[PDB]
């Protein structure tokens, strides 16, 4: 009952642009699997996680980097930061150095007993393979905290992307130059994996189309030198690395498929919670998206070993997500979650106060019942107000809106501008009428028609080292400016 529903909806929609109906159609195709689907999805997710853990255990460079980071964080002998919480911290199927050493002793022993058995007849020896299998079985019982697990996964992804980029660059430099078949190239590259003996065999072969090879022979080895350096830095076989990468990719694909199936199955629960929480807020679409994000964050941390129902956990996570979204978003100004909770508590108290008394809750009684000062209550009542729209009509008639009803008190007015212009013109005229050096010192001290306002020592170092003479000149200029015959025109600016 999937194709017929889609066909009927597409034939019935008369160019309707309702996102709610589109979302309901997209989520209505997947049905529910009660008590039998979620368990299988969780089992497949755990199987994928175990496959990823096995692929990591078969990749000893990750364990080497982990041990190096542990040695770096322990070399200071005093470190109890948040980095310890992101370590392995295995579970028994708070933190203390004793148990850490007790659990890492056998790990270090296995590491040092496996590192010595690498040169034993090669990397594919029977004893070496058994030791690697034992190390992997031991590592499988260690659950990694996602804090550093995400960093390790990102590092492995970066390494795999670099390897694939080098391989693609080599393939391009081969194809775009010599037009070589992929079947005769990838096969030899996988079979040899050591040197350029396949290149010598291709040269020995006739290949009439491969005569144009001397112009790219100098670049083939230069490009393969990067792969040789990568192999020397890693020190592992190419076949095992490719197998680990393929297994990790398959596991990640299965995990993503299981997560998508769980999300498509719980979309109906998400929309049911949205209907149970039908508040206008910002919009129903934003609330549905927040619920979906919460559902994904819950699935990324959910397990079926608790023996309970995923419905309650998903509901709690969706409620938390919606609360955070309505506290942060769905408002003009940003209000913190703590302030929102305090406002909600004050409203719940005022609801009972009005039900018991019948009058608006006074701030004094509210502060006495809340055991808080009246200043906080007053500030909350002042700030908690929804901003008024800009297109609200001032009167009953919808003729003139609130577009032009506010005065511009930010910029100045022509009155003060003309007053300041007349004042500066009068001061300039007075300075021009006075002595030259006096006006120069007054302009360099206060900043009339000058950018920088020099101090006493600056004006001194510019004009005369004696700072007392500059002070005397400034005082004489001020005393001459305070003369009534010359201040009769400046007394009018006493108010300004």
């Amino acid at each position: 009952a999937a194709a017929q529903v889609l066909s009927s909806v597409e034939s019935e929609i008369g160019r309707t642009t309702d996102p709610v109906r589109m979302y309901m159609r997209e989520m209505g195709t997947v049905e529910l699997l009660t008590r039998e689907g979620e368990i299988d999805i969780a089992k497949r997710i755990e199987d994928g996680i175990n496959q990823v853990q096995c692929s990591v255990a078969e990749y000893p460079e990750a364990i080497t980097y982990l041990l190096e980071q542990y040695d770096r964080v322990e070399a200071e002998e005093a470190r109890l930061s948040d980095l310890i919480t992101g370590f392995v911290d295995p579970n028994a199927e708070s933190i203390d150095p004793e148990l850490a050493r007790e659990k890492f002793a056998e790990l270090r022993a296995q590491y040092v007993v496996t590192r010595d058995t690498i040169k034993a007849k090669g990397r594919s020896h029977a004893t070496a393979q058994e030791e690697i299998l034992k190390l992997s079985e031991v590592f499988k019982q260690f659950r990694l905290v996602p804090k550093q697990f995400d960093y390790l996964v990102n590092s492995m992804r970066v390494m795999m992307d670099r390897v694939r980029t080098q391989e693609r660059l080599i393939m391009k430099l081969c194809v775009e130059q010599c037009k070589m078949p992929k079947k005769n190239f990838i096969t030899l590259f996988t079979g040899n994996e050591t040197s350029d003996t396949w290149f010598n065999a291709a040269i020995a072969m006739n290949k009439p189309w491969s005569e144009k090879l001397h112009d790219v022979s100098e670049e083939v080895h230069r490009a393969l030198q990067k792969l040789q350096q990568i192999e020397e830095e890693t020190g592992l076989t190419i076949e095992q690395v490719k197998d680990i990468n393929r297994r990790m990719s398959i596991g990640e694909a299965k995990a993503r498929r299981a997560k998508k199936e769980m999300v498509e199955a719980n979309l109906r629960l998400v929309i049911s919670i949205a209907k149970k929480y039908t508040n206008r807020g910002l919009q129903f679409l934003d609330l549905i998206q927040e619920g979906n994000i919460g559902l994904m964050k819950a699935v990324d941390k959910f397990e079926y070993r608790r023996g309970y129902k995923f419905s309650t956990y998903a509901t709690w996570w969706i409620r938390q997500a919606i609360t955070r979204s309505i506290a942060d978003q769905a408002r003009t100004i940003r209000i913190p979650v703590h302030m929102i909770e305090t406002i909600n508590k004050l409203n719940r108290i005022s609801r009972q106060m009005l039900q018991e008394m019948g009058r608006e809750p006074t701030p004094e009684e509210l502060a006495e019942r809340m055991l808080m000062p009246e200043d906080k209550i007053r500030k909350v009542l002042k700030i908690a107000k929804e901003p008024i729209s800009m297109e609200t009509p001032i009167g009953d008639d919808e003729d003139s809106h609130l577009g032009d009803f506010i005065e511009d008190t930010t910029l100045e007015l022509p009155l003060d501008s003309a007053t300041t212009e007349s004042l500066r013109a009068a001061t300039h005229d007075v300075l021009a009428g006075l002595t030259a050096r006096e006006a120069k010192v007054l302009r360099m001290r206060f900043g009339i028609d000058m950018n920088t306002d020099y101090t006493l020592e600056e004006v001194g170092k510019q004009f005369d080292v004696t700072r007392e003479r500059i002070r005397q000149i400034e005082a004489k200029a001020l005393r001459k400016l305070r003369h009534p015959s010359r201040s009769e025109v400046l007394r009018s600016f006493l108010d300004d």
Partner: protein, 187 residues
């Protein structure tokens, strides 16, 4: 300054980026305690300039003489208030968007240039059905609509050559891959 004519044309993305002097990421307008804009808000003082007349955000840069000095704490260029009047911002989007008024306005110039009715491009943009951008095989060609079931039926058969995207990306790829001179000659 005296302009001769008034030209109207389509705006370029890089030109819109050059018009702005910063990107707006957080939708915060103001704080409930202080009316100072957030350092990444809508009308932030770093992107659109100072609020007051030649005054920084933290009120440290007095002495108006200091002009064009970027602060190390708030980072507000000390200029006049009218700077905010003649400047705009930009928003970096993740997925491209189709201009609504370019196809909703009659006579649906997008549908005229693409030779496709309005209902089809509406179903494509609103993610109701998929469209083939360019088909190398002899099965389908450009401007072919496939539903959800048809897309899955056609995707399991072939691969690595069936080019199809969703709405805005598909339309952008079609507009980029199309040639105007060949279509004009054909018409």
């Amino acid at each position: 300054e005296e302009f001769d004519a008034i030209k109207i044309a389509l705006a370029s993305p890089d030109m819109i980026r050059s018009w702005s002097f910063g990107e707006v990421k957080k939708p915060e307008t103001i704080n409930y305690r202080t009316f100072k804009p957030e350092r990444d808000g809508l009308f932030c003082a770093r992107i659109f300039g100072p609020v007051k007349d030649y005054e920084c955000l933290c009120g440290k840069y007095k002495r108006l003489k200091h002009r064009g000095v970027i602060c190390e704490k708030c980072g507000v260029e000390v200029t006049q208030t009218k700077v905010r009047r003649e400047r705009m911002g930009h928003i970096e989007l993740a997925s491209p968007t189709a201009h609504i008024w370019f196809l909703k306005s009659l006579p649906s110039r997008i549908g005229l240039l693409l030779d496709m009715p309005l209902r089809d491009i509406e179903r494509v943009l609103y993610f109701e059905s998929y469209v083939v951008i360019e088909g190398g095989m002899t099965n389908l060609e450009r401007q072919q609509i496939l539903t959800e079931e048809q897309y899955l039926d056609a995707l399991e058969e072939f691969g690595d050559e069936f080019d199809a995207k969703m709405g805005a990306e598909a339309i952008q790829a079609l507009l980029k891959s199309m040639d105007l001179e060949q279509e004009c000659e054909q018409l």
